[PDB]
Design a binder for this molecule. Structure first.
Ligand SMILES: Cc1cc(CCCCCOc2c(Cl)cc(C3=NCCO3)cc2Cl)on1
Ligand SMILES: Cc1cc(CCCCCOc2c(Cl)cc(C3=NCCO3)cc2Cl)on1
Lengths: 273, 255, 236, 40, 273, 59, 59, 57, 40, 40
């Protein structure tokens, strides 16, 4: 492939460099339309800018935490982090968010990796070996109330059991309702006068729930869960302007008030170098 | 003697002529078309009013003055009240449509000024409150009036800051969306053909707007000496290939 | 039972590896795809669309005005604007090009810089745009500027001029984050003759300026952007 | 070799090697030729 | 292959052993040009002197250390070794350095092995199990300020998570800007009068950053990281004189003052055996 | 699931072993090679060039 | 001995995965099947039989 | 596979929607027996409702 | 590839792709045609 | 068998078995024959 062809002096009536940008086109002008060039080859394919590659590496999408401790006398397991949940969403963390929001609709399978590490902030004789249980409560499913409920039975709910310190991994098809995931949605659930606005109304795919299978030892053990997400088989439509201001909420476009100028002011003139 | 410059668009029972055009944009290089069976889901036969809905509606005019910040209309909202297009809209459960948008602004060879005319698929607005305040329905359904970016923040309304596109992105990059400029010195109209763009084959016309049309002054209007300091901008829009499905009782929407 | 040996790296999680995994939802059938206009396949497809450069960066809060390069009637010989070419920083940084370049470590290729004139139709002007390849200072006067890559632009019916910064380089890749060894030059613009307004007209006229990449362009070695960060996870 | 039955479980896809910027860079209705005048 | 051919008495006008070294050549003289030889075969190929073999074994290129401890009240994580970095360079350790500097330009893919072991120098009830996270911050990337920043999200930055005591391994293509890595560079960044001199200006490929994912237990744990590097697919040009004096700095050729004579002095005469 | 048995040596790191590894930079394209005079392939090539001997070591 | 590398997810138990296992009862012979009317293959077969709706829910 | 065929107005002596449930059958009535439909395809096989799948986790 | 000798040890079965609701939805002795009168 | 997609991930290269010291041992412009006089 040639990156530049050889081109010499020109004295024409045919001027490729004068255009009318009002038309909305970006005319494909090249170095050889306005200087004299020599042949050179590309030596490159643009492999690593493919959208599959761009969205295809694992990104941290969520960090939660649960603890193993005596539940005796706990009136609210959920509240004691005897077990937590993550109401599946990819808008939490902004690193992967900005990347995704470069497009309007996106379609992909997900591969999740879940790393779990334990901490024992206060005096323990040892490090126990705990087994985590991650179960996906599809919307319209009995939500775990306790840490050893009947829900954890998950007889129809896909669940994975792995050891703390270890990692769990699996992949999920694209479980979108539509033909693709809406990165943006300028509409509402229904024609109400108070109903929410955005995608937060469209992206209601239940939540994930973690818990430690093991009973309690004499000390307490903090287990912190990190969920990583990798898109595989990516398809993206309609590019948009990149995010400039900071994010404030999962699912709304809102930016913070009295934010700071995002364009760097010159130290000098327009004329400055 | 054909120029890129003169054009005629006849759609239904209405025709537009421009003698100072700058080509026309067809979003994503695709022209509006009906919904193919292979893509269909709802089993209902659809209704295609054709020429009674696919004609040109001219919205009320705006006034560009030296202080203007820009205006924003949503589709199909802007047309919610135009003739039979609008009736069909409130009466069917689902509908689908593409449009021809023609924005008009003429001046003289002594004026200067340049407007950006852009179509943004799925333009989800931001609340000026920040945090996770929502933007109430009425605020994103201004109707033919559209939203005036130089109007004041209101409560439950969107933010109207231009250099952020009403969503946290910079004005400068709106050029990645199908758009055309109106530069008084060149141009006097802008025309964009919009194919139907959605993640579902057909949708509700009232709970979801699928494009915002935005006209934004970028190089300020500058009139000749002792000229009146303003020009009107007119927007005429025509639904094209419209289909309605799931007819019934007639939606009632807030406000 | 087949005998195996495990190598160093067993059990590691590399966020960039690409392997098979069990599906949690065995046998599930995804929604059919329908057609949607606009599919993107390569980021290289989109960085060829031009977007506006806030060249007039001299303001103090972001404003529509930093997109406008002003022009003065009747000045002769003088300089319209100047900038270095660190596409990952400074004026370029918020543009779509700048914004994507920042997802990669290295770039190579030609850039297309165009200027669209917005003055009254009955005015006229001749400007010179000059690209100064690495190795010399930003030009200080047109004489200096005109000895490097340049285009005399004659403002006419055809409203925009497209200047190309041809890839001039020893090393075949430059770093996107500004680096010296790897630096690309300067871009300046001067009156060639001068802007002239018709009667009954007055004041400043402005140029809009765009940037996009030529088909020439290469970007490689993906990394994280300095353009976005956060202090606590977002909630609903 | 796929070891698993479902398609979601396969590795990353392989390069589009599609690439056609014209839907984004030249969505004009009447074709523009480089070198010919923009507005006739 | 014959290592020596058979050759007998000679009384010629053709003298292969008289040459003129002033020419710059090393004339290919053999035993059989000056004594009577018998046939012998080589029995050898020179396999283990191939440059791929010479540079192809893992060498330790870096030892760093980080600790897991309560960051509460630490004003400078980087400074507490709550996390460290290694500003990727292969000039640190001299064992592998001398080998590489036998050539001027070198081109190869790298295979890294990272061994991490833990130490608990002061009273602990136990040994905790920590998980290390090595992320490569390409130059022009948000540098981790803290130990649980947003940077560690590394959504676009290749990162690996492995357990202490264990090893991590991967390989990287040749990420050089040019066609090959410059082992030496007699130039500057630009025509300045104070700008640095050497390769230290050419070899600016960011740095690697390590950290422990796990929160803090009651005791403190020292984790010491050793990075090993193996060249694979080696290509080397222009041999040079081997390094004689000791090294003083990464990237400069400088040797220490009042160094010692590097040539061993005879214990005796020139005539001595 | 195929039955396996691991042998002695599993998990060891031998600095001299030669195996495959995942690339950290999937799909990256290295700079083209250009021609450079002087390529060395074997150390046996270079030890045939003669160099001076500090024979007079007595200093 | 063939060189291997284990990936993330090793040792996990996913209640939805489908693999082979050793039989605890090697060589056992199950009872022959006889014919029974009524075999169901898909839940989609049965949701097409209509059943009564307690529409008058007001009790 | 078609999920619905195209069907238009009807004015017949052949009424598929009147039945006698006392018989014990569930007559296979479709949308196209009582409204005007357009063609649409199934795009689906009913894989995940197989009893092997239902009892197999 | 089965690694094991017994049939119980193989993975899950594969979709019936049988599907015939008529034993449940139309177990009537004399065949009913849709469109013809239910009771003659 | 390569298990990985990228070339960097393959094992060590295989012996040049190239070997030609003359660029280093005899870079003279006019060819010298062993046995013939060095300087004529
Ligand atoms: C946009 C967008 C995309 C997504 C992803 C939605 C996730 C779908 C459900 O994914 C899971 C499934 Cl199918 C199973 C499990 C699971 N099975 C056993 C343990 O976890 C977890 C998840 Cl997140 O969210 N917004
Ligand atoms: C000469 C010379 C050669 C080199 C080597 C440069 C190293 C290039 C970058 O290498 C890495 C990559 Cl691409 C990834 C990772 C990494 N990914 C996940 C963890 O570490 C680490 C390194 Cl050193 O330095 N001087």
């Amino acid at each position: 492939t040639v990156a530049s062809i050889s081109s010499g002096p020109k004295h024409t009536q045919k001027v490729p460099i004068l255009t009318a940008n009002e038309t909305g086109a970006t005319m494909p002008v090249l170095p050889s339309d306005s200087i004299e060039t020599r042949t050179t080859y590309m030596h490159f394919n643009g492999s690593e800018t493919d959208v599959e590659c761009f969205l295809g590496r694992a990104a941290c999408v969520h960090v939660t935490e649960i603890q193993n401790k005596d539940a005796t006398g706990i009136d609210n397991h959920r509240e004691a982090k005897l077990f937590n949940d993550w109401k599946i969403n990819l808008s939490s963390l902004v690193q992967l968010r900005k990347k995704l929001e470069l497009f309007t609709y996106v379609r992909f399978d997900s591969e999740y990796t879940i790393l779990a590490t334990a901490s024992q902030p206060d005096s323990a004789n040892y490090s126990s070996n705990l087994v985590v249980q991650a179960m996906y409560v599809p919307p319209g499913a009995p939500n775990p109330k306790e840490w050893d409920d009947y829900t954890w039975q998950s007889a129809s709910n896909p669940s994975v059991f792995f050891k703390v310190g270890d990692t769990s991994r699996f992949s999920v098809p694209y479980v979108g309702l539509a033909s693709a995931y809406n990165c943006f949605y300028d509409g509402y659930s229904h024609d109400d006068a108070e109903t929410q606005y955005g995608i937060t109304v469209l992206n209601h795919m239940g939540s994930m729930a973690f818990r430690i299978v093991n009973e309690h030892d004499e000390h307490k053990t903090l287990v912190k869960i990190r969920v990583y997400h990798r898109a595989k088989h990516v398809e993206a439509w309609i590019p948009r302007a990149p995010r400039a201001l900071p994010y404030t909420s999962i699912g709304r476009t809102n930016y913070p008030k009295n934010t700071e100028p995002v364009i760097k002011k010159r130290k000098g003139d327009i004329k400055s170098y | 003697g054909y120029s890129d410059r003169v054009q005629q668009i006849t759609l239904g029972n209405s025709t537009i002529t421009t003698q100072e055009a700058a080509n026309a944009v067809v979003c994503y290089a695709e022209w509006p078309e009906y919904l193919p069976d292979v893509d269909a889901s709802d089993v209902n036969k659809t209704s295609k009013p054709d020429t009674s809905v696919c004609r040109f509606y001219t919205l009320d005019s705006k006034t560009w003055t030296t202080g203007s910040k820009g205006w924003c209309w949503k589709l199909p909202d802007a047309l919610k009240d135009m003739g039979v297009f609008g009736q069909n809209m409130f009466f069917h459960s689902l509908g689908r449509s593409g449009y021809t948008v023609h924005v008009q602004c003429n001046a003289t060879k002594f004026h200067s000024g340049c407007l950006l005319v852009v179509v943004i698929p799925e333009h989800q607005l931001a609340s000026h409150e920040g945090g996770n305040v929502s933007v109430k329905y009425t605020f994103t359904h201004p109707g033919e009036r559209g939203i005036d970016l130089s109007s004041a923040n209101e409560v439950g309304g969107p933010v109207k800051d231009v250099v952020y596109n009403m969503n946290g992105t910079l004005l400068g990059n709106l050029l990645i969306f199908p758009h055309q400029f109106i530069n008084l010195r060149t141009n006097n109209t802008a025309t964009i053909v919009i194919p139907y763009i959605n993640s579902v084959p057909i949708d509700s016309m009232t709970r979801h707007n699928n494009v915002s049309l935005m006209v934004i002054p970028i190089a300020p209007l500058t009139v000749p000496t002792g000229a009146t300091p303003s020009l009107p901008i007119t927007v005429t829009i025509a639904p094209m290939c419209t289909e309605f499905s799931g007819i019934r009782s007639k939606s009632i929407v807030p406000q | 039972g087949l005998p195996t040996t495990t190598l160093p790296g067993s059990g590691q999680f590399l966020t960039t590896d690409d392997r098979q995994s069990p599906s949690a939802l065995p046998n599930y059938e995804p929604t059919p795809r329908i057609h949607i206009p606009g599919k993107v396949h390569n980021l290289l497809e989109i960085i060829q669309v031009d977007t506006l450069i806030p060249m007039n960066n001299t303001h103090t809060k972001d404003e529509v005005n930093s997109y406008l390069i002003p022009l003065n009637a009747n000045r002769q010989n003088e300089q319209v604007f100047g900038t270095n070419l660190f596409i990952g920083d400074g004026v370029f940084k918020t543009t779509l090009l700048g914004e994507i370049v920042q997802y990669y470590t290295h770039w190579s290729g030609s850039l297309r810089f165009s200027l669209m004139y917005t003055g009254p139709a009955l005015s006229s002007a001749k400007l010179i745009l000059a690209y100064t390849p690495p190795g010399a200072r930003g030009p200080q006067d047109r004489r200096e500027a005109m000895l490097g890559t340049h285009v005399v632009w004659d403002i006419g019916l055809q409203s925009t001029i497209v200047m190309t910064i041809p890839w001039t380089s020893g090393v075949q890749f430059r770093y996107t984050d500004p680096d010296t060894y790897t630096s690309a030059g300067f871009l300046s613009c001067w009156y060639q003759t001068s802007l002239i307004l018709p009667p009954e007209t007055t004041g400043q006229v402005y140029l809009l300026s765009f940037i996009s990449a030529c088909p020439d362009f290469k970007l490689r070695l993906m990394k994280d952007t300095q353009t976005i960060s956060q202090t606590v996870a977002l909630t609903e | 070799i796929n070891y698993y039955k479902d398609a979601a479980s396969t590795s990353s896809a392989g390069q589009s090697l599609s690439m056609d910027p014209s839907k984004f860079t030249e969505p004009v209705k009447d074709l523009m030729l480089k070198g010919a005048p923009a507005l006739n």
